[PDB]
Symmetry: C3
């Protein structure tokens, strides 16, 4: 293949580049020199490793297409990514829509996705809410009276006009669930690729601490992502999970020039079998790293292992094969 597949050396590059190799592409990783051995020795998936944050000129010379990882913007910055001259797999317009709280909320609302209700006025609280001062210092409130007592105790607020820099959301209790999707622009087909539960510290460690021991300390709960655990869902939940993905894609077609490639809806499942979404990640997510050898979902419909990384490379190949590569790049 003339086209080479390139990605930033973090997040999901091992999976992406292995998938590319499996589909007959030459591969490029670019990033920190510290991690070069990971991609060239321990897991030799990168044919070229460039020790630079964003080697635009070298990437153009190598006829690269960049597959954006789930931390691509974090490492490069939104402006650099939006203005990059190297072709980008996916729609670069999505980056603002997935990251700006207001745009994200608008997208999810248009897509008819269940999300926590936001309260602009504490005096409107009628069911338990989570209060987010600007995980740092998050607390629950039952009602307006409870809220104001806690605003005084935790935030020093003694007058209503003094309240500032807070978010108040409907509190939704459920188990974390992260469905991984792929929308093929070539085939105009949505797929469910896999599902995981993100493994987080210290939040996933506190359950091992008895209540008595916890209560002696002021707990500082954190949600740092450490890894991922494979799951499957109850089968009867799949249709609504898939329909949610379809609606997100459709809404993006209207709002931002489309959504294609991998994405994920991040949320929880309540005891009443409701999927409530906290965030959309409109790129490959780290949970897909479990499924290098396929998943319980891909093995229902393919005769070979298909990771999200491989699926991306399959899409790029099929685009080239059908003379429509420009359609999947921005």
């Amino acid at each position: 293949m003339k086209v080479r597949i390139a990605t930033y050396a973090s997040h999901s590059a091992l999976q992406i580049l292995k998938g590319a190799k499996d589909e007959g592409f030459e591969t490029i990783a670019f990033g920190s020199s510290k991690v070069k051995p990971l991609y060239t020795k321990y897991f030799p998936v990168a044919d070229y490793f460039i020790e630079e944050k964003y080697p635009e000129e070298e990437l153009l010379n190598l006829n690269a297409v960049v597959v954006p990882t789930g931390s691509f913007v974090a490492h490069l910055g939104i402006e650099l990514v939006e203005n990059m001259k190297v072709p980008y797999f996916g729609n670069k317009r999505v980056l603002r829509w997935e990251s700006d709280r207001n745009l994200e909320r608008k997208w999810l609302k248009k897509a008819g996705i269940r999300v926590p209700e936001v309260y602009e006025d504490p005096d409107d609280i009628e069911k338990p809410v989570i209060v987010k001062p600007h995980g740092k210092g998050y607390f629950l409130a039952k009602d307006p009276e409870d809220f104001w007592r806690k605003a005084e105790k935790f935030l020093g607020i003694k007058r209503k006009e003094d309240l500032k820099n807070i978010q108040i959301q409907e509190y939704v209790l459920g188990v974390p669930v992260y469905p991984h999707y792929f929308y093929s622009k070539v085939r105009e087909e949505l797929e469910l690729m896999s599902i995981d539960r993100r493994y987080e510290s210290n939040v996933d460690a506190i359950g091992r601490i008895p209540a008595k021991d916890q209560l002696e300390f002021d707990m500082d709960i954190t949600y740092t992502v450490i890894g991922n655990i494979p799951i499957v869902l109850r089968e009867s939940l799949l249709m609504d999970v898939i329909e949610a993905g379809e609606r997100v894609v459709k809404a993006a077609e209207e709002l931002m020039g489309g959504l294609w490639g991998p994405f994920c809806l991040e949320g929880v499942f309540t005891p009443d079998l409701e999927f409530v979404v906290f965030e959309i990640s409109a790129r490959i997510v780290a949970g897909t790293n479990i499924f290098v050898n396929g998943s319980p979902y891909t093995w229902l419909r393919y005769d070979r292992p298909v990771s999200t990384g491989r699926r991306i490379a399959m899409e790029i190949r099929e685009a080239i094969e059908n003379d429509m590569l420009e359609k999947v790049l921005t």
Copy 2:
């Protein structure tokens, strides 16, 4: 094959029908129209989809054998299932024995399976018990005095003669474990297929909530099944897990005309390495859905991926091949 494999469109139908396809059968899903796309588009495992709860006449015409899912009776009702004219993979007599609390207890006792002791009289409590008023309102009691104090506080009981509508069981603390078995009637051989931990809401979410935050609320703990997480057991535990399965099968041979096909013992492992069983599910369980591409157990003994769904289809094929199909159907 003349025989087609049919199942209700929920619970584990994707796995069942993929397994059937893998073994060279034509496949039928039947159920809600809402879920037709799941089985024909997103995961195209159903050659026929019938939009009816139980299309008996159409199934007979299609020469179907029905593989009962783990929620088959829930959707159809016990009477309809017991009287169905379409051949059923497994022993239909098992349905009452697995579902009636007294029959289930008798089965497990005959099979020498460790289960929580039941207390008929609260005044007999000598170790911690779980009290189940008729997960709704479950609480622990240490001894008779503690029980009666709590019966007054939680249930309004002020006289011993006024106590009604409760179950009292030995409280057994351990980690949830769900071994998945398959008994081949064709080969007269029990297999361990896989093992999972069922993922439940809100119970599996509360560990993420610090004790201090929990204590401000009356917790309403629920056990709604959301998904499944793959596990393996400590190897030295396998023999007793397998022996338990053998005993369950043997006991069924005496009591109810036999047990064959998939089943699962649902319970916990204590810190003293004891498997304590809460329930028997005498049909395919949703935890097997993880293992479409085989499991850490099947890959010890097969040269190809074998899910429980595939194993069912293998049994039906081998029955046909050996002119003994009638032996595995009721």
Copy 3:
């Protein structure tokens, strides 16, 4: 092959012997008669089963090489293992270094591995510590004053000179993570094989118990190993995990005549992305049992399923092929 692969019938023998078979070796399990069916009927991976703790003469006659399981010394005792005449895969000198608290600490320090700080004097406590009286009776202390109050309340200590039989360690809160490594002496190459989270009772069950219910009882937290759950790590964490493994191997080359074959660093990941190690297991660990059909890591670099058991057999084969078997045996 003239050489046969033998292992004790527990811990990881199914995986080890399946891996051996996959690489063209004849296989031997030895151990308790009770478990013979596991290795010969339910999972037929053992060509020979010897119903003895350590059948030295029979093993020599069968030209066996013993692959030590992760519980080998537990069942046989250190002296028997150190003096065994049957060739042993790995370095027998490592057994003391991984098991003696002081030697283990020296090894990890030489290897520059982050470990909990040990306090010899309670009056030196300046950050939260875990106190380990000789999981039985473990508690946290904030500072010297808190420690002495608790030493009085829990341990009956009323004078400083009366304190004895305790360990005091820096308390490190993070999520359990168990990377599985393999060092090839034949290739002089370290590999990351897989990663798991060990499933433990009753510790992993207490998160399901609401704080209110816990507080009515004196909790007795236990860490009995029941099983294993597959995970992957955040990709950016891999380099430092791998570097830790390299340093452990290098340090062993100096201290104890080398480390080769499988091993595992057991620890936690903090919210600041720090891997803190509690223990080294310098042999195959049970978490590798999940990966009979390979792992998310091995499928990045092999075209076939490679468990740690298979990798061991691959090493023995390659040693034989290159006339250097003596180099990997002690």
